Write a protein that binds this ligand. Structure first.
Ligand SMILES: Nc1nc2c(ncn2[C@@H]2O[C@H](COP(=O)(O)OP(=O)(O)NP(=O)(O)O)[C@@H](O)[C@H]2O)c(=O)[nH]1
Ligand SMILES: Nc1nc2c(ncn2[C@@H]2O[C@H](COP(=O)(O)OP(=O)(O)NP(=O)(O)O)[C@@H](O)[C@H]2O)c(=O)[nH]1
Ligand SMILES: [Mg+2]
Ligand SMILES: [Mg+2]
Lengths: 243, 252
């Protein structure tokens, strides 16, 4: 709706890729695409929204949260990107029901093309709190949503602890989390994990992770692949919420 | 005449940078000097914050296990060492928070395990690079107060780990440290039902920590963290509050 000026801030190799990635969504009569960003938080939702958009579109508090949700919309090459930032779902050791019901009621009649479930890469645990969140997502929008889901781990410019190589650490935390979201949602198929450094930078031109991958292209690429799998999208009716 | 005394202690110290051992040897005299012949340090916190790593750092030996994913270990380990007449005992403990809630199995064995021991210092442990503070933290403060009294906090030191941290958005290290501290002392005090000391010290347990020219581990703020810590321990050891004795009355 407002024009995607943010891409201009990206690297030319990233600009070229996003215009090509946006190109083959256009090629498939995919013109809009709505992404819902949900999680925990203070785990980098807003920041991720901001990195995608290419500018500071959502408030990031370094110290306490909130309950906004926002959709920001940016057109380019005839394609329109809607991202929804949303409050963290957890309060103390419980879901914040008010906050969930707001997300829901703000989504009333919108269409979730891709859900971006955000957590930190550099956490050392999973537990009922992670389970509850996957539970809340599934009860709100159905188990069908997880086929249009991607898990994004932020603080990806981590170097692990006691000499654990970067991949081992990564690989163990991906399963740790994938197992427990799969549990709370009750569930294969995919379901993709991408890495994210909102840092800002970051080490072509655009900005690689400590395993070689350029993540902004990689995330929009994963967003296109999850956007084109079928699958279908999820139309958030007044129906679905009472589930 | 001469005897063959037997004693525990402390090969760990020899592994510090020289400049650091010197300070530590000095502080231990400071303690002996005021007739403080042993210290028991109780180390408590949320899980996965570096309680064990810190105990390993202070003792300067892998004596307690490390857990990058996992927990695992649900019972206290005490490590005890000596030098020149002084005995250091340090109690590592399991994270008191699990899932949403306090873990009273964890908690209860901590309590049982401390009976008849005396707590000279409480090392409340947390991460520096956490952005949020909520009731889970406050539940932890409350659980400690409940278990030991508002008096334990006169022997509290709060110790934030992963100190080698470049704060986001260019916010300067000290400014971050200060807001994190302010926010956490607030919520400890709230759950603690208090209202300093409470000193806050930073910790970076990593091998790859930066070093000053004397090969001491340094914070980005320029301070040699280990001596600084041992020194805060000493000031609290020597402040004018009572150590905490663990009766049945205290823990019930
Ligand atoms: N180093 C680093 N810091 C990050 C990253 N993502 C977020 N942060 C930092 O973590 C803090 C929280 O980010 P934010 O986007 O507000 O997270 P949130 O999940 O939206 N918080 P809330 O849920 O309360 O709205 C900020 O200080 C931000 O800079 C990342 O990839 N790397
Ligand atoms: N970079 C860095 N990692 C640290 C630091 N302290 C601890 N860690 C890492 O954080 C993880 C947790 O350490 P650990 O000592 O088990 O924490 P804990 O508080 O004892 N956890 P638990 O409650 O399970 O016993 C380990 O991977 C360890 O390597 C620190 O100062 N810096
Ligand atoms: Mg946010
Ligand atoms: Mg431990």
């Amino acid at each position: 709706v407002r024009g995607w000026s943010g891409i201009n801030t990206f690297a030319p190799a990233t600009q070229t890729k996003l215009l090509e990635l946006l190109g083959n969504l256009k090629q498939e009569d995919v013109n809009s695409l709505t992404i819902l960003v949900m999680g925990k938080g203070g785990v980098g939702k807003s920041s991720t929204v901001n990195s995608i958009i290419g500018e500071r579109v959502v408030s990031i508090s370094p110290f306490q949260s909130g309950p906004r949700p926002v959709m920001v919309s940016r057109s380019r090459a005839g394609f329109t990107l809607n991202i929804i930032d949303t409050p963290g779902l957890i309060e103390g050791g419980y879901i914040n029901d008010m906050a969930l019901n707001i997300i829901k009621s703000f989504l009333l009649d919108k269409t979730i093309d891709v859900l971006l479930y955000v957590d930190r890469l550099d956490a050392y645990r999973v537990d009922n709190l992670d389970k509850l969140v996957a539970k809340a997502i599934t009860d709100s929008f159905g188990k069908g949503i997880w086929n249009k889901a991607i898990v994004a781990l932020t603080h990806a410019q981590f170097s692990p602890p006691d000499g654990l190589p970067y991949d081992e650490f990564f690989s163990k935390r991906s399963e740790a989390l994938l197992q427990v979201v799969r549990s709370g949602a009750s569930l294969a198929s995919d379901i993709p994990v991408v890495l994210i450094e909102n840092s800002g930078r970051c080490n072509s031109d655009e900005k690689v992770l400590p395993n070689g991958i350029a993540w902004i292209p990689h995330l929009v690429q994963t967003i296109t692949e999850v956007a084109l799998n079928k699958s279908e999208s999820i139309f958030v009716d007044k129906n679905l919420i009472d589930g």
